[PDB]
Design a protein around this ligand. Structure first.
Ligand SMILES: [Ca+2]
Ligand SMILES: [Ca+2]
Ligand SMILES: [Ca+2]
Ligand SMILES: [Ca+2]
Ligand SMILES: [Ca+2]
Ligand SMILES: [Ca+2]
Lengths: 163, 163
């Protein structure tokens, strides 16, 4: 497939109907998933990689992801996002912190996986989704908490490591 | 092979499975190894050249280097990096200072070489790696120190010149 890059602007990106991958990285340390961004996939080998130094905070205004099967979200700080709306066609959501909190809610139909390194006193909380997986290492004080607001459609699989 | 250039953005670079070389220089004196950069090698003639006026500090968030055999790191200031993770497939790490400190840790299986010109009162400290080599010139006050925290798998070979 083809590889498509988001900018610090408003992007209107449309995939090849093939193995295509969407990059929502940084530009000068400025986020590229931004207001009004609309992304569209085509055929079923579609990936969105969202990577940011800054904390993920929510989906930004007017953003719509569609036809993209896998969403990877990685932050230098906390993640807080909800994906029960704006996002359609998403089978797999993977969220990644190292050393800060996570507060994620997925739509049913989406397999959530919340990987967290060096969790320390930070709290993971996840909700909704189809199959959920929590994978937390370096844990300490941190609560892990699943389905407190909305249960999973499928299986829960927490795992937690402490040193 | 083919020759691939990193930008001040998020790069998704994939080698030919051949003699390919990856350039991670500067753009306006802004680093090109940056958040979310993912690099991928293929076959075994793979080189990453990372060159920066600014001190090397750590691998940036979400960066994954993979399938790349040789990593060259050159800085106008200090180097501090650990490569026992994030980097996979790495047989050779070479780090280069001129007139500032070095604090490097390599994974076993990786041959470390820490070359330092005009060391002066700056301290070299290295750890881990397979074969390690320290090559220090213009030395003065500077301590040289190997395996204080983790020994080498193979041979140590320090050499130190003072004027
Ligand atoms: Ca597609
Ligand atoms: Ca954008
Ligand atoms: Ca698709
Ligand atoms: Ca880059
Ligand atoms: Ca290659
Ligand atoms: Ca290779």
């Amino acid at each position: 497939g083809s590889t498509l890059s988001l900018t610090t602007g408003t992007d209107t990106l449309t995939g090849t109907a093939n193995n295509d991958t969407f990059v929502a990285g940084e530009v000068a340390g400025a986020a590229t998933l931004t207001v009004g961004d609309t992304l569209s996939g085509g055929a079923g080998t579609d990936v969105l990689n969202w990577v940011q130094a800054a904390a993920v905070t929510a989906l930004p205004t007017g953003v719509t992801i569609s036809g993209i099967e896998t969403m990877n979200v990685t932050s230098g700080a906390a993640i807080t996002l909800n994906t029960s709306s704006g996002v359609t066609g998403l089978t797999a959501l993977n969220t990644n912190t190292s050393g800060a909190a996570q507060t994620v809610t997925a739509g049913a139909g989406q397999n959530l996986t919340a990987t967290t390194a060096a969790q320390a006193a930070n709290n993971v909380a996840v909700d909704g989704g189809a199959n959920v997986t929590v994978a937390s290492t370096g844990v300490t004080s941190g609560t892990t908490t699943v389905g407190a607001n909305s249960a999973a459609s499928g299986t829960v699989s927490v795992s937690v490591a402490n040193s």
